[PDB]
Design a protein around this ligand. Sequence first.
Ligand code: ADP
Ligand code: ADP
Ligand code: ADP
Ligand code: ADP
Lengths: 329, 329, 329, 329
Amino acid sequence: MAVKVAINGFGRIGRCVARIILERNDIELVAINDTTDIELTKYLFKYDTVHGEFKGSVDSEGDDLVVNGKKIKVFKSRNVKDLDFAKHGAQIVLECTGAHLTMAKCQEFIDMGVQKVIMSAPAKDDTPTYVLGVNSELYKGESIISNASCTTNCLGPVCRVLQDNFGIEKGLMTTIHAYTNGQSIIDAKAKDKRRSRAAAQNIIPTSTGAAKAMKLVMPELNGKLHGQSMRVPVIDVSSVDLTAQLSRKVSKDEINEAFRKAAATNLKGILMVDDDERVSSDFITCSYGAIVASDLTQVIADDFIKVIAWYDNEWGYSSRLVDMAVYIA
Amino acid sequence: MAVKVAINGFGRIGRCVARIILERNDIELVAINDTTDIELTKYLFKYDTVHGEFKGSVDSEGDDLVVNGKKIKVFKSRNVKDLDFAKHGAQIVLECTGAHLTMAKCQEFIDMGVQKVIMSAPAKDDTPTYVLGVNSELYKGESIISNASCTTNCLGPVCRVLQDNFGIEKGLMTTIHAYTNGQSIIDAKAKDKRRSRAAAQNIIPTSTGAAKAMKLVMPELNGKLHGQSMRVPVIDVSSVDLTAQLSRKVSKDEINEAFRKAAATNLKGILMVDDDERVSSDFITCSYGAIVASDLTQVIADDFIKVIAWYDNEWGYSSRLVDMAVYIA
Amino acid sequence: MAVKVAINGFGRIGRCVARIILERNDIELVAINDTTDIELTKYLFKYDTVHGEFKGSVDSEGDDLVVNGKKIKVFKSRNVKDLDFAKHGAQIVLECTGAHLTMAKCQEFIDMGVQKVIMSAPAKDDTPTYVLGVNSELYKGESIISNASCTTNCLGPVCRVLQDNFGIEKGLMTTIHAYTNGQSIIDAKAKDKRRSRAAAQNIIPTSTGAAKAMKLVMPELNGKLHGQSMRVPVIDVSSVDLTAQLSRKVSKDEINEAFRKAAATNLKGILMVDDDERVSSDFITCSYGAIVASDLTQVIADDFIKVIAWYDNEWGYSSRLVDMAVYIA
Amino acid sequence: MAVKVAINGFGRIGRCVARIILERNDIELVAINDTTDIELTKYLFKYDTVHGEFKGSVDSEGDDLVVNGKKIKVFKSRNVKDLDFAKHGAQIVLECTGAHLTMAKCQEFIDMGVQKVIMSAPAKDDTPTYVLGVNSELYKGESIISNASCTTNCLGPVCRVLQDNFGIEKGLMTTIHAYTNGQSIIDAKAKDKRRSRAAAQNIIPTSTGAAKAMKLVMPELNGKLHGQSMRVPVIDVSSVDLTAQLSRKVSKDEINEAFRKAAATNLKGILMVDDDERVSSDFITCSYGAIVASDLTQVIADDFIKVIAWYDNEWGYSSRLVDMAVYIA
Ligand SMILES: Nc1ncnc2c1ncn2[C@@H]1O[C@H](COP(=O)(O)OP(=O)(O)O)[C@@H](O)[C@H]1O
Ligand SMILES: Nc1ncnc2c1ncn2[C@@H]1O[C@H](COP(=O)(O)OP(=O)(O)O)[C@@H](O)[C@H]1O
Ligand SMILES: Nc1ncnc2c1ncn2[C@@H]1O[C@H](COP(=O)(O)OP(=O)(O)O)[C@@H](O)[C@H]1O
Ligand SMILES: Nc1ncnc2c1ncn2[C@@H]1O[C@H](COP(=O)(O)OP(=O)(O)O)[C@@H](O)[C@H]1O
């Protein structure tokens, strides 16, 4: 039978995760929680500036969303103590609030009968971290895990291929990243100077720990990677720009062939290669965590390389969260 | 001597008001309040995506902003009871928080020794409303007033000219309006459905009461005007699109000549006429409340007219708030 | 059997028209022409920033595009004399170049064996003009016709309903319009001052004759309508903002009910009513020529009304061109 | 006396170059050429979406632009044979057309009495290439030179400092670059697939030879650098993202101190360091070729570094062209 899941937090990730679950037979959505009334929940689920209109009926009956005739319980509580997800059948909670990123906070779900919690972001403690195609084979049945970040689910698969074929001595990453709800529409108070600046009218440097944290899913890369983000005025879709020194001389063609081989085998459904010279909008609603743009791969002086890989920072990660629920179930 | 003022709320309006006060000799800024630490206050005041870098030194000494060597007291309190503006010399409070739009709330400033409060938005009670060039001549020395909205300070001057020259039987307004901090950067919870949608990637209908509320500053227009807003992906600058039936036959040339005449006389510094076929960006940091685009003026069937007037929805209104402080002082 | 058509001009309209023809059984695409090599034709047809990836195989075999295994002849000639569309079976030419908008120019297609030409824009001569749901019933089998503009196929259906139910005395229209290939990406030479200005960073007034030209499809509106356009930074989807004086007192509810009634009957598939408070992105790839936003309908002083109707300025018009080929065939 | 110059090509670079010349006393603009009538020349020079309104009078008298009362001859000819710049006093021609990037083409100006030509882009032949602060000291009085690209005038100064202090073994560059007139406003035919895609709605990979061509101004870097561009939806301002392996271990602080030292000495007016955490809009109309964002400087594993440096891709380069005319005069 299909694993039954609940989504805590009905934001960009939570709603993309719900749409993907509704497309599949191997997982079933039984409950959600946000701080939104049901009329706004329905409206944001039905209509999406980025991913288009949900095809199918989006109704309500009290505090049930009814999607293509199936009832989904809607809670509306900031407090984990009021969220009896397991009473509605939930085996796994997808933790999409950004607010509960320690095992201590997630333990309440397990206490209330949930079997597993998956954090939709890097843990703030030493919660075990798993990324499909990267270290998912090492999963030991832990109750609480992190699925890392959207960037990790792009950079991670790229590093898996480079490490396994050539070896990584060191590297630095820039993500050219879509703006997010963490940013300001106009110059206004936010958690730091640069995030306070108008997101759709600037290139905005922002931090990411995605690269240093690769040590969690690839311990061989401990101390060998750092990175940063440059937020640009697109609503969705981002790129990993990885510059690395490999352990031996390689060619562009060799690098791209290694990616196409992984795309057909160990990273099927996870990493693909673009040989059509697409641009960012072409990857809107793409389920792959990494799309290597083969023509952009560069090598200089034998061992010094650049790889550009696209990711739908919403849909790729959301697809991995759903894949990860099915896998650990 | 220059009137001494304080700004409550250091947002888009509050910071534009502060820059304009610093350009003038007839008014002096002695204090501000927001909920922001001083490092972020300085950064947002110095650097502006829309209006460019402040020319001149922006320093701090404890909880004083120091601008071109002059000290400005910075409070940081949500509660009007902690804001002794008058202790720092403030005669007028420019109420730029959006949070204190009744005489009851503003009365606390007067109780604590402020002589006058000007609301930076339409009042939610029957606080007297004044708009320069429209009904400012009727000011009776009231302690608490509203300066109405950015839209009123565009529509109002346009209606003054049309009413005084031709007569207005009825009309409907659309503002093609820049996005604002009331809107969402990505599809996310906001106070209504349409405001929840990504502001820089949509045309977004939104309400404005600016037209019905014209009855406050032009009672002859009671029951004769309604309007609405269409929010579009520009960071700043908006247009009033007024369609009206006048009391007699007019020509395009007659309408435009009436506007140029007011621009030279009763609406000097308030309404101007564009005869250069400018676009919206050309009015960034323009102090005029209304810029009639003369070539866009239309008449059909004798008495049925359209006027398009630009406004820097930040700078024009901010310039009027400062003008209004000087005028009532 | 399905009417066989050719598309001259493989731009935004030409490629949307081709995608719609490929979705339908009652019309078949046999040939296209542009000034583009086949590799770029394939790329622009397959990948679309606005309407998303074409689902299905896009290949070539010499100067045939092969779409889901069907061969489409691709010409590459500026000169109508080199375009033997009828030799590849074409009965109707959809004239999507913007360059051949007189009967004199289109006569060459008829001379070379084409039975009918439909211009994808208003005629520059007295070519008969037809708009579905507006005056299509009057079609007399003419060989060469204009389908008017994207704006006419929105305004036209709106006026049909208002005229037939209430009567139109006079009105003025503004379209809040997506930027187009007629505009400049950065401030650079174009055919006029305002079109020379950066399209994605300005509100840009531009002319439209759509309103005065309504006399071609609704002669009763001769001398009663004018309009103008305000180009705003969205890539696609526009709105008609019609302000009109009707022949009698009406209510908002009466106006909206008249539109829903036409939506179910005489304007089925042509005009619909939005009762869900959508924004512009929600109408991307919508086939309706007009989507009345019911909650935005306004009436003041009995007879003075405003109607806001969305249109996918690419897809709605393209859907009408295809409908018009099927209808006249 | 001030060097007298002419501008061939009145585009983004040509008009920014003209505004900078008008701010300075050491150079004088005597003539321009474009393919634009005088009314449009005046309009585009006076009003600028990016750099704001020209302060001062912009008039015409026949085929003279009159700027703050000074007459500038305006030619309007595609053919260098009709451009007697030297007859109007021009000693140096700033070649801003993008169309004359070989010594053979520029020789006609010298034949017609011009003393020096500076190309506003990389040469397509072996025209000598000079970049201020990088190899300008080696200038030998050549008649025809290239000022390289906007990217070279950012990357070049950054490499000068890194090479002189630490040594560069190898590196790869990405520019996160503002869209340009080389790109399409909507999906439409351009010179390649990716440039055909809507510039304000995509991240668009594009080539730059700026890095390999560094061998022209720094021969020690022959074979050690490659790069690429990612075009993003900002109208202006770009960043060099340089990842390099240096000849020895360095620290972040050491790298940033080397840049501040060059900023005060050998690269005064050319490279500066941002210690204020600015974003892209803050560098609009900035004259520096490179603005190193000090907080973004990264080092991993001793010798593997990343430097992010902003550049106003219009104003920085234009300022260098004017500096280069003054220098070689
Ligand atoms: N404690 C909480 N309980 C429930 N929902 C929460 C809580 N904290 C945040 N949320 C919701 O989580 C969502 C976060 O979504 P959003 O801001 O779009 O970002 P993301 O890109 O991570 O999905 C929002 O709907 C927000 O209201
Ligand atoms: N009660 C309050 N006390 C102090 N500052 C406040 C209060 N409420 C809101 N503010 C501030 O008022 C400002 C509103 O600015 P912003 O959101 O940019 O909008 P506006 O366009 O009206 O200026 C913000 O700086 C906000 O933090
Ligand atoms: N004479 C011509 N022959 C063939 N194709 C033409 C001719 N003139 C223009 N075109 C093509 O017609 C198309 C117009 O499309 P576009 O500029 O996107 O505008 P629209 O919005 O009207 O479709 C382009 O592909 C252009 O190359
Ligand atoms: N042969 C030519 N003679 C004169 N002007 C030319 C010629 N070729 C191009 N131009 C002009 O050169 C300018 C190039 O400017 P633009 O496209 O904005 O790009 P850039 O970013 O390089 O300045 C335009 O004004 C164009 O009309």
